[PDB]
């Protein structure tokens, strides 16, 4: 467990310097044909550095001239024999006090290295190489440009987590306010590959711009299938994301224990708020609002379903079968339990769905619905 702070030193921040080498006396690997970073490489390298400082307590300051630096960047083009090397990609040296520690090197004969802003593998390579220079040891043609779930955990173990990042209400995906290219989709042709770090506020996964059937999971540490890819989005350990918006596809939106606002969008969606007081919008289409236990919608913290469509949407209470299939009752409970009732509040046009579970002395489950609902909309 090597870091810039030493060996087996955990949770300690670092202030590091970096430098784009303009010349070298030698490359520590023995490769030759040094070429300095071009303008695009410089911009993309800084974006990679930023993606690391976003998640862990690292500060990076550029130095120039003859000043030494913790982390350095340079290209090579030839092997130790002086022959052209068009085959290799990049490498980096771990932190330490030895010559070349923290240095990272990239093959200028690779177009992805020269053009990391338009060839995604180049940006990913920068991020990856920097990870090693910091002490880390280890999708349909696209490459994630920022640290993924395990590396976020690992780098935070070394340097501590950055609790100042995006502490406001943050939106990831379409309509993003992150000012990070890897969290931003500007149109439906853009692929998203990221693991979100977010240190506070009420946040949204906006994947509204895609037509693919998506699976969006708001659980900490969980993976989502977004924009037609699989497992391309995850939520880092230590992060709570609150809201999700699906696209025009037939989606599955899985909430977490927090109070979530879930919007299915068009298409026939499945929405599962989970624990907490959730607000659910199925959107256009034949949507299903799923309840997996009495704890999903207690009276003290009940769900709202804000756009329910009688005769079109469904509410799934089949999970309650495990203690005896629910019986639907018209306007009164018997006291026997395992009963469900739809109660119409004519003054406010709200339907209250009350569910009385066996063994409960009071009716403890409620979902409030803005609109009418029928017995035949309820799956028991």
């Amino acid at each position: 467990n090597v870091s810039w702070n030493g060996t087996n030193v955990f949770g300690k921040s670092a202030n590091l310097t970096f430098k784009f080498l303009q010349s070298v006396s030698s490359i520590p690997s023995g490769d030759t044909g040094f070429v300095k970073f071009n303008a695009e490489q410089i911009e993309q390298a800084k974006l990679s550095l930023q993606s690391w400082s976003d998640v862990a307590n690292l500060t990076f300051t550029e130095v120039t001239g003859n000043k030494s630096a913790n982390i350095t960047f340079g290209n090579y083009t030839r092997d130790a024999s002086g022959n052209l090397d068009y085959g290799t990609q990049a490498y980096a040296y771990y932190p330490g006090n030895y010559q070349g520690a923290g240095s990272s090197w990239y093959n200028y004969n690779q177009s992805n290295i020269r053009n990391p802003g338009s060839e995604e593998y180049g940006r990913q390579t920068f991020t990856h190489e920097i990870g090693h220079a910091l002490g880390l040891a280890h999708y349909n043609g696209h490459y994630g440009g920022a640290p993924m779930i395990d590396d976020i955990a690992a780098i935070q173990r070394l340097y501590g987590a950055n609790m100042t990042t995006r502490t406001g209400d943050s939106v990831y995906g379409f309509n993003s306010n992150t000012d990070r290219d890897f969290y931003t989709a500007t149109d439906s042709s853009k692929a998203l590959i990221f693991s979100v770090w977010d240190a506070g506020g009420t946040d949204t996964f906006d994947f509204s711009g895609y037509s693919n059937n998506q699976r969006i999971n708001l659980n900490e540490g969980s993976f989502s299938d977004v924009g037609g890819l699989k497992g391309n989005v995850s939520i880092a350990h230590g992060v709570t994301i609150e809201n999700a918006i699906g696209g025009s596809g037939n989606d599955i939106l899985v909430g977490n224990s927090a109070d979530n606002i879930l919007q299915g969008g068009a298409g026939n969606d499945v929405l599962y708020g989970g624990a907490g007081a959730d607000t659910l919008y199925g959107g256009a289409g034949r949507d299903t609002f799923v309840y997996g236990s009495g704890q999903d919608s207690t009276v003290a913290a009940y769900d709202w379903i804000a756009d329910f469509q009688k005769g079109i949407d469904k509410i799934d209470l089949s999970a309650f079968r495990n203690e005896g299939q629910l019986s639907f009752v018209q306007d009164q409970f018997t006291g026997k339990g395992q009963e469900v009732m739809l109660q119409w509040d004519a003054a406010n046009s709200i339907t209250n769905l009350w569910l009385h579970e066996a063994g409960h002395s009071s009716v403890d489950f409620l979902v409030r619905i803005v609109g009418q609902a029928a017995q035949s909309d309820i799956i028991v």
């Binding site: 090597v2 690997s29 085959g87 990609q89 771990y94 090693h132 040891a137």
Partner: peptide, 7 residues
């Protein structure tokens, strides 16, 4: 201590 990235 050097780590290589795949090409």
């Amino acid at each position: 201590a050097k780590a290589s990235q795949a090409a």
